[PDB]
Structure 1
Amino acid sequence: AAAANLNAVRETMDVLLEISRILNTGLDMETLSICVRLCEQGINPEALSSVIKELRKATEALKAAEN
């Protein structure tokens, strides 16, 4: 029972990773796993994605200012 649920969850995680790769979403594995747990527990994916994009753009801007 629990083993079957764990196998289903691991298959779901692998399928989500495959879907992200096919969509070229460019989301890391740790980031995807944290966002998956956050969305299951209850959080706005749009807000989380906006914050992640803001952090990525801040990193790119910091690299540009370094250059």
Structure 2
Amino acid sequence: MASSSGAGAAAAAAAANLNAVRETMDVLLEISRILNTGLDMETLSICVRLCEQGINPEALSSVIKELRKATEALKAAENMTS
């Protein structure tokens, strides 16, 4: 009976961490919305993972800007071809 208490608590801690991450991501999304950043939940989550994964913040910022410019160019090309 002893062992089950640890795994349940670990799972609860992981779930709490997930909920906290979700709350943080929601806060970030709200900040972006007030700032009108234009990032979606999936893109924001991917960016969060990338920054958490060690991307250089100057590199990460430049890459994000370049990716955003490329996405805007691709959307403009899709709208011009449509």
* Fold-level similarity (TM above 0.5): yes
> Secondary structure in 1 aligned to 2:55?
coil
SS where residue 58 of structure 1 aligns? helix
Is 1:50 aligned to 2:78, yes or no?
no
Highest RCO, 1 vs 2 (Cα 8 Å, sep ≥ 6): 1
% identity of equivalent residues: 100
How many aligned residue pairs are there?
67
| TM-score relative to the length of structure 1 | 0.66
Whichever of the two has the greater Rg, that structure is 2
| 1:25, distance to aligned residue in structure 2 (A) | 1.0
Superimposed CA distance per residue, residues 31-65 of structure 1 (whole angstroms, 9 cap, x where no aligned partner): 21111100000113444444454455456556777
Contact 1:35/1:45 (<8 A) preserved: no
Unmatched segments (≥5 aa) in structure 2: 1-12
The answer to whether the 8 A contact 1:39-1:45 is kept is: yes
CA deviation after TM superposition for structure 1 residue 12, in Å: 0.7
Q: Hey, what's the Cα distance between the residues in 2 that align with 1:5 and 1:51?
A: 28
Deviation at 1:3, TM superposition (A): 2.0
State how far apart, in whole Å, the 1-side matches of 2:23 and 2:52 are: 16
1:61 to 36, 54, 73: 73
2:32/2:38 contact within 8 Å kept: yes
